[PDB]
Amino acid sequence: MVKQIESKTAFQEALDAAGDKLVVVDFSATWCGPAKMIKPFFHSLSEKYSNVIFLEVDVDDCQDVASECEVKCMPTFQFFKKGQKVGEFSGANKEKLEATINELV
Amino acid sequence: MVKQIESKTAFQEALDAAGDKLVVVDFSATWCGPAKMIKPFFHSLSEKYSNVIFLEVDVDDCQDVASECEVKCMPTFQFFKKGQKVGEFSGANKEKLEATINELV
Amino acid sequence: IKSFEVVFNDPEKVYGSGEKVAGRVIVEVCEVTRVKAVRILACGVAKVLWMQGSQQCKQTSEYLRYEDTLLLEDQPTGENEMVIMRPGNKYEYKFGFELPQGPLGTSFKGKYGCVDYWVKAFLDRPSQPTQETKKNFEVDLMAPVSAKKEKKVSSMFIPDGRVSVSARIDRKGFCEGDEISIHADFENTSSRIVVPKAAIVARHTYLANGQTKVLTQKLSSVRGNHIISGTCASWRGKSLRVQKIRNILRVEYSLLIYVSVPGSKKVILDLPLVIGS
């Protein structure tokens, strides 16, 4: 399951919430065709990989975290272990996303 | 009657074969309304003043008589005696015509 | 001089784009007059103006510049022979000109602008100052502008690939020196990498060689990050400067927001501006 997210302090939280567990973040957007298409696939993967923490951030809602994280486009996905990014890619590609998820757990 | 001058020669002969008599010359053109208008009158006069000699000159037929006499427009009337000009005026004017005649016989 | 007037054939007419204005200048004098010429100028000038916060901001744009020297019908000789005018008769000079099709620039004949047409005729007389007679004739904006465009950009594996651009700015009217601030969303579900761009362009309509010409100048411009297939990106306050520029009737201005697409035609928004000083 995927925690919607609305503040940088709410963001800090999850970075704690997950222990040693890798955490994937969809920086998404409402009006974006490709991010809308990938949302569902992002949701099911959260059902599968419950050893992993999924989160969403709306780039328009959190202009601030989007920037703290140099996000340029949507969907962009970023991966952390311990708190520090280890993965990240852009584009609505399910396969790449599972592939990266696995390939980083 | 009016005598038709056909040339510089005819002209000279007219002038000298005249006597002491008064010669009147209507410098004329066949396309000129005013010259056309006064022709019959010139002619009635010739029949009346049978002691005056009446010539006509076509300025188109004899431009040479015309320019030697310095005719500039038509009808122009010139008046002679012993080869020599004693009168002149221009324009289709019966009254003026009869006056000069009686004034210069 | 007894009377010098410009009179149109339909004195009650208000005129339209591409249409023909005609009539005459009529002159009567008390005493005889040597006249050196009668000449006409016809103009159209819209003038758009406003106060930013509380500042003097204004653009002027012409739509007619027409001049001719007029000629009495019974006076065929030419402009290097003066005419003798006399009491009694009433001397009549025809003129005829025909407006340009396209705008006459009423557009913001509103709270913000206004539009001046008229005809001056001039009487030139030896050792005199030319006399003149002037006769008129007839023929939001601080609201936000926003626009959108989509273009199918297909692929064997993405036969429904699209590219779009949706754009917004604060108003149509800007002072030299300002920043135009841009809000824009770009989508790219096509197989190409695409690049979004913007430029302010200047279209000078100018008088040259019997004409009738417009030249396009590119002023400030920016370029965004390339956008890979299956993504979107955004401008949020990304800003373009309005620079001063250095026989032209007017300059029309536009903001162009376009996404350039390799192998295909641009997807172009053209957003009209008004730009004053």
Place this chain on the structure above:
Amino acid sequence: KSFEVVFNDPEKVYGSGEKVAGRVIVEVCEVTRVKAVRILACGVAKVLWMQGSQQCKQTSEYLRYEDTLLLEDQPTGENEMVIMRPGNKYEYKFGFELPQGPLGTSFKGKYGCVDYWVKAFLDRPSQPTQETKKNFEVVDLPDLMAPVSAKKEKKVSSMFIPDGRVSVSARIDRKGFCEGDEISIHADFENTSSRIVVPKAAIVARHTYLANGQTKVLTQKLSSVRGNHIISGTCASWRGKSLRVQLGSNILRVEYSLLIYVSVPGSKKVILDLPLVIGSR
């Protein structure tokens, strides 16, 4: 590869005023960078003849129209550059109107011709400017050396001469003169009106030129004569009264008339207007 001027109505004969429109159509077999696509469109007449040993020529421009073409995909305009791959047709649109007046009227006959055409220049990478030219036909809606002549009559009435009239007719030998020759005028004038009238003649020139942004016309009385006062109730004639013929490169053409008119005091002039061609040595 292909570089072709293509009119929308390939068969039209254009009339004065109409507007001429088409496309310049550019096709390529390998990738090219284009600095500009331009056009110039002209219309010009040359009247040309021998006057004995010596040639006399008048040249008239009816249409001097230049311009740079923009493609729809060039929205940043023309100090910007284009990129031409094979396989699609590049179409540059162009238009203009024919001037108002009388146009030379497409000819290739005894004393010369009149051609209108459109020229398309192209400018590749680092190359000189290639060319294509295509004619179009034009039509305005008497032999140069035949005699020209006219007559006119006006009622100049009088309370005492109601049928008062002034009339003139004149003839000249040809219509074409070289600068320097004289025009020998044959004219007959009749005046049955109550005024004294004065016959006059004059060469008048209309210079058509480009001031901005227009085609203007400057008119100039260029040489004239004055006959004798013709008094009421008379006629008079010119027998070859003779009359000599003697701004910038915005000067397109000049048109000439011999005016032979009569002045009637307190009434309109009576005017014959005989057109002329006037060439130089």
